[PDB]
Chains A and B, each alone.
Chain A
Amino acid sequence: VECDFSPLLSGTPPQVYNFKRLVFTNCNYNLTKLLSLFSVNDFTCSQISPAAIASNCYSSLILDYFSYPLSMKSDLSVSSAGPISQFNYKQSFSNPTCLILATVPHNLTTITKPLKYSYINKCSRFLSDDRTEVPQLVNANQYSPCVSIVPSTVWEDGDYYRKQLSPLEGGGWLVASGSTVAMTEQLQMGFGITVQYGTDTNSVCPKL
């Protein structure tokens, strides 16, 4: 009956492009509970307020968590044309969203550091001609098409990863370029929260 945030606290977290996403329905939550754990460093919402999001009822609650370095905080949100928003992670304009930047305290054993921070600097599909490139920009709430060709972690900064598309797919190539950022002393993470509205169920409401 209580929302299970446990997968977040166990194991090694995914990078921004391949972020693990949890969907909650029919359960009660104590957001306070989550951020109690972490040394939060930023916490902004759009179309909702930080106080309101933890004290309202929704059809569904969606939580994205991933490894993200604070150094790149500017790039991550909103206006910035930095690839992060272009090719890696975009939040919904239409619905109320929150973006949380936090740091894993030393007391948290359970989470595991990644080798490094990885992200896609560019994602493009090349036509059969192999001259014509059609940039693939991610939609909100959706995953870069290059997640299929890019590694759990970029092996090395400046690596190119490419795949060839079955003639069923129209041929040509799917081409991505990756970048890396050295791991911090403490793992820094990003959390993305979004909620959805439905007639039948407002079954995601705060535990009391």
Chain B
Amino acid sequence: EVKLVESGGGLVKPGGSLKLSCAASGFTFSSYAMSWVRQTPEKRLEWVATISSGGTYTYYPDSVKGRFTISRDNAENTLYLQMSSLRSEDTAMYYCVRDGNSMDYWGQGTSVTVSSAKTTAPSVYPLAPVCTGSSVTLGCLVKGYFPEPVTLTWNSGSLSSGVHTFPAVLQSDLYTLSSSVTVTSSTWPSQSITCNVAHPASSTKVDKKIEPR
């Protein structure tokens, strides 16, 4: 397998509007209820809206009611959430979910941010060890980017172990993130290691080869 893929998330100014989508597959869409559940910055989980298999009935928390509208298209096999009069409270991860007594399956989520702050492309800096060891640790630093999120991978996601990517830290309205990769001495520097960073909001793509300092 079943699958739920959310899309439409992004940065929107307070009072603004936005519409999320969720692509369903691997099960009969018409036959199950559907819900939107969002997780806040605190990691709080709060239900947002639920809709009947028919599309006939809808339900919303008082807090979100009348500003958010939940719709589904059975033929399309997608579930849409349309939001308006957004406030900073509304910022959360958003999950396509399949309902019933319990939420059967969840989408990976889409991140929605409501702020008057300005979108900012991250600045990406290679981290290279001081001028040793059998092994060696290298880093990518992503700085000054708003809003979340960025996806960072090494060698096009080819190399995934010895890899630690640390949670973004928000200071002064801008986010800072870093990742470390530890690899065998020989492998760097002889063979290229490249940091790959994407900021969708800023439409930023950058790959930085890590060259010896």
Chain A positions near chain B (C-beta within 8 angstroms): 148-152, 155-156, 158-161
Query: Who on chain B is nearest to A161 by CB?
Result: B100
Residues of B within 8 A of A148 (CB): 101
Residues of B within 8 A of A152 (CB): 101
Is A156 within 8 A of B57, CB to CB? yes
Is A155 within 8 A of B57, CB to CB? yes
Return the contact of B52 from the options A149, A150, A155, A161 (Cβ within 8 A). A155
Is A160 within 8 A of B52, CB to CB? no
What are the nearest 6 A-B pairs in CB distance? A156-B52, A155-B33, A155-B52, A151-B101, A156-B54, A156-B57
Query: Who on chain B is nearest to A152 by CB?
Result: B101
Query: Who on chain B is nearest to A180 by CB?
Result: B57
Give the number of residue pairs across the A-B interface with Cβ within 8 Å: 29
Is B101 within 8 A of A155, CB to CB? no
Q: What CA separation (Å) do A150 and B31 show in the bound complex? A: 14
A-B contact pairs, 28 of them (CB 8 A): A148-B101, A149-B100, A149-B101, A150-B101, A151-B100, A151-B101, A152-B101, A155-B33, A155-B50, A155-B52, A155-B53, A155-B57, A155-B99, A156-B33, A156-B52, A156-B54, A156-B56, A156-B57, A158-B53, A158-B54, A159-B31, A159-B33, A159-B52, A159-B53, A160-B31, A160-B53, A161-B100, A161-B101
Report which residue of A148, A150, A152, A155 has the largest number of chain B beta carbons within 10 angstroms of its beta carbon.
A155
Residues of B within 8 A of A158 (CB): 53-54
Query: Who on chain A is nearest to B55 by CB?
Result: A156
Question: In the assembled complex, how far is the CB of residue B178 from the closest CB belonging to chain A, in whole angstroms?
Answer: 43
Report which residue of B50, B53, B99 has the largest number of chain A beta carbons within 10 angstroms of its beta carbon.
B53
